[PDB]
Structure formats: structure tokens, C-alpha cells
Design a protein around this nucleic acid. Structure first.
Ligand SMILES: O=P(O)(O)O[C@H]1[C@H](OP(=O)(O)O)[C@@H](OP(=O)(O)O)[C@H](OP(=O)(O)O)[C@@H](OP(=O)(O)O)[C@H]1OP(=O)(O)O
Ligand SMILES: [Zn+2]
Length: 384
RNA sequence: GCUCGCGAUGCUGAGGGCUCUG
RNA sequence: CAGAGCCCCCAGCAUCGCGAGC
């Protein structure tokens, strides 16, 4: 695991393996998938120290009509997005773990940080797997395997390169945000405005500035970055590195601990094959500790009986509130105070919100567009 | 090298249908 | 109620050509 290609091949093997174990060795009906993703944790360089944290599948996003004003629906079921949400549940569990008694502090991946709150114990790293290239910048210009003849991008200084791009409801393509400068509205989307969702290349880039942990968790922990991003197919390195960080090397004035993370980027030795079939309309998820995968309809953002996912906003907020009650005031990384409304609680994470603003400005100043958010009303709910 | 326009050939989440299945 | 196979269809990108601008 000291070598990059060995690591890359190992994380693919592990995520795939785990996916098999959870689906009756690849023969369960939920083994059917177009894209697989997961996260792996390494705690030191032995192959045995490596552990699968999460697994997911999916290729689709929510239909506009099914947005939840209560946070009960998954908005984006592209596999790598779901795999991050699944890792958030691990992070919550590992916080609780440390918090429940002194003995358990040995186990937990967190320790107290010398600057407040919590940080990862040294040599704890997470690695992202995607069985293909993330949509947007990393994918759109060469959405096929690389060919040994002319592998290099011939027009790297085109304006299209680096652009922020959106999944577009009912539309193919990943479309520049330039061309939808209007902000999105709740009443608009419901009537038929096509719901825009930032592309996966864009979101990963964002995680390489603001951390993978989100706003809420940053109230308790320091920023966590992916150390590797491994692709099982369609690896183009010049496009991938552009997309994941290099396009915003212009970024500045990040609050302390935040940075422009530049993870290992790799393909695998033997790429995955195009999976046969119509692309399934469900997304599967699993975090370590769960007894099974959870199956979500990507169009409703719910399971087949209309029940909310363990990974929905409301579920995550519920976790954040459990953990909040066990963290003494003096151990909070932010002591700024907000009402118990999901939107408001995220604003307590001042330094995260500031990093986020630096990100949005980096993209604008580089000529790459303005980030496109959900309608204001999405996050305006409380618990119960 | 890039931008704009015109053409041409392709690439990549929905919609309508037919056939069948549970 | 749900799924599959096959047909038809629907805003970016690639390649190449034409004209122009930087
Ligand atoms: O990429 P996803 O996993 O879909 O989720 C994110 C996440 O929202 P939740 O974690 O609440 O589901 C962001 O939250 P933080 O990074 O702040 O923790 C939120 O960003 P804002 O809170 O900054 O708005 C962003 O939403 P947005 O669409 O407003 O960028 C939203 O992504 P999606 O809406 O695309 O799911
Ligand atoms: Zn995607």
C-alpha cells in the first residue's frame, strides 16, 4: 500500500468485494447497477489495516415534484454522492463511540484536538472509489476509455474546460451554470422549471476545499479530506486533475485548517466493463455497522414504501442533534448559536461557510460560473 | 492558440410506443 | 401495481470543414 497503483487496485477490489457480500454474491436483484462507488479507510500501510466504510450505487437525481420541505428525500443518487453521505453516518457513529466512555476512546478514529473539538487520529485516511468518471468536468469531454494513440486533450484552453456544470432534470448532458444564471425557486421547480443539480466533478472539487464532512459536522470536527480518488473506468488524468482541484488553484484566504486538497488520482490496472442493461432507477447504500443495504428510488428519493432514507437530511440532522447533546459546550469548535432549523444550524459553522464562499468566488473569478443552490425553502425545517 | 457564426458526422437524463414477464 | 427487451423521440460536448474576429 506504499505504492499508488497497489492502493488503487486494492480499494477497487475491496469495494467490489463488499458489494458482493451485501448482494448474495452479486446475484441479488439489487446487484443490478450501472455505477458503483464506495469509501475505504486506511489506518496505516498494511493491506489488512484497510477497511470498507461505505458502498453505493446509482445514476439519477430526484424528480422536482418529489422534493421534501421536511428533508425526508435524497436529492442526488449518483453513487459517489451517496457514498459520501454514508461516510457521514460513520463519522457520527465514531463521535458517539468516543463520547460514550474512556475505554471506547481507543477504538474511535477521533481524538481531542489541541485546537478545540475533535480531529482524526494520525494515519487515518479515506479513499473514494468510483467505477467510472464523475459527471461534469472530469467526464464530459471524453466519456469513453482512454486510447493509447492520442490520449492527451488537444484543446485544453477552451472556455468549456473547467466550467461548473449541472445535471438537468429530464435532459441529457451536463450543462454549464452560465446558461442558467437565474436562481432556482420552489414554486418554479414544482410548476416545471427543470431541477438543476451540480455535477459530481463539481461536488468533489468542493469537498477538496471545504472537506467531506459537511457544515454541521465541522461544528464538532476539523475538516476531513479524501487522500485518494480512484476510478474503475474512464480514467483521464489531465481532465480529472483539472476537475478535482487544478481549475481553482486561484483560490485564496481560506480559513485555517482549510486548504485546496490534492488527493492521489488513479485508475485501476484492469478497468471495469460497461455494465449491461437499462440503468436501474434505484440507489443502494450501506455503511459499515449496518446489517444490510438500503434500497432507494432515485426519482422519489425514498424506498419503495415511501419511507425516508437513513441518509436523508432529516436523518442526518437527527444524528447531529443526538451527538450535540453529548458534547460539552467547551468542546464545540463553534460556540456560535442558532435556532433548531436545519438551515440555521448550518450557519453556525462560520469557518465552513467562509471556505464555501472562497470556493464560489474561486470559480467565478476563474471564469467558471456561479454555483447553483437549491431553493431557500429546502433547508427550512425542524425535527419531529 | 482562442472566440463567434454556418454546416456535417457522432457522443451523452427524460418522453411516446410495441412485445413480453412478475 | 412493478420490471425487462426492442423501436421511435428529445443542451451540451467531440471530430472535421467553411466564413469572420481577437
Ligand atoms: O451533495 P449532497 O450530498 O446532495 O448534499 C449537499 C449538502 O446538503 P445536505 O448534506 O443537507 O443533504 C450541502 O450541505 P453542506 O455542505 O452545507 O453540509 C448543501 O449545501 P448548502 O447547505 O451549502 O446549501 C448542498 O446543497 P445546495 O444544493 O444548496 O448546494 C447539498 O447538495 P444537493 O442539493 O445537490 O443535494
Ligand atoms: Zn454524477
Amino acid at each position: 500500500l506504499h505504492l499508488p497503483q497497489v492502493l488503487a487496485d486494492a480499494v477497487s477490489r475491496l469495494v467490489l468485494g463488499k458489494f458482493g457480500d451485501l448482494t448474495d454474491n452479486f446475484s441479488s436483484p439489487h446487484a443490478r447497477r450501472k455505477v458503483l462507488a464506495g469509501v475505504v479507510m486506511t489506518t496505516g500501510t498494511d493491506v489488512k489495516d484497510a477497511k470498507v466504510i461505505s458502498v453505493s450505487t446509482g445514476t439519477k437525481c430526484i424528480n422536482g415534484e418529489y422534493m421534501s420541505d421536511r428533508g425526508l428525500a435524497l436529492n442526488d443518487c449518483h453513487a459517489e454522492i451517496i457514498s459520501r453521505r454514508s461516510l457521514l453516518r460513520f463519522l457520527y457513529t465514531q463521535l458517539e463511540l468516543y463520547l460514550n466512555n474512556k475505554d471506547d476512546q481507543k477504538r474511535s478514529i477521533f481524538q481531542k484536538s489541541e485546537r478545540g473539538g475533535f480531529r482524526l487520529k494520525e494515519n487515518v485516511q479515506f479513499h473514494l472509489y468510483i467505477s467510472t468518471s464523475p459527471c461534469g468536468d472530469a467526464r464530459i469531454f471524453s466519456p469513453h476509455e482512454p486510447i493509447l494513440e492520442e490520449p492527451a486533450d488537444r484543446h485544453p484552453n477552451r472556455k468549456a474546460r473547467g466550467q461548473l456544470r449541472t445535471k438537468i432534470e429530464s435532459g441529457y448532458g451536463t450543462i454549464p451554470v452560465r446558461s442558467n444564471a437565474s436562481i432556482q425557486t420552489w414554486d418554479g421547480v414544482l410548476q416545471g422549471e427543470r431541477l438543476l443539480t451540480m455535477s459530481c466533478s463539481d461536488k468533489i472539487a468542493r469537498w477538496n476545499v471545504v472537506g467531506i464532512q459537511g457544515s454541521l459536522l465541522s461544528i464538532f470536527v476539523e475538516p476531513i479530506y479524501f487522500s485518494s480518488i480512484i476510478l474503475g473506468s474512464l480514467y483521464h488524468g489531465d481532465h480529472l486533475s483539472r476537475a478535482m482541484y487544478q481549475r481553482i488553484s486561484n483560490i485564496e484566504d481560506l480559513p485555517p485548517l482549510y486548504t485546496l486538497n490534492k488527493p492521489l488520482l488513479s485508475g485501476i490496472s484492469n478497468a471495469e466493463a460497461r455494465q449491461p442493461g437499462k440503468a436501474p432507477n434505484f440507489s443502494v447504500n450501506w455503511t459499515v455497522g449496518d446489517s444490510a443495504i438500503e434500497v432507494i428510488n432515485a426519482t422519489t428519493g425514498k424506498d419503495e414504501l415511501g419511507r425516508a432514507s437513513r441518509l436523508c437530511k432529516h436523518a442526518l440532522y437527527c444524528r447531529w442533534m443526538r451527538v450535540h447533546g453529548k458534547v460539552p459546550s467547551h468542546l464545540l469548535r463553534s460556540k456560535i448559536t442558532k435556532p433548531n432549523v436545519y438551515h440555521e444550524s448550518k450557519l453556525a459553522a462560520k469557518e465552513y461557510q467562509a471556505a464555501k464562499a472562497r470556493l464560489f468566488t474561486a470559480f467565478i473569478k476563474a471564469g467558471l460560473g456561479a454555483w447553483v443552490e437549491k431553493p431557500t425553502e429546502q433547508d427550512q425545517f425542524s425535527l419531529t
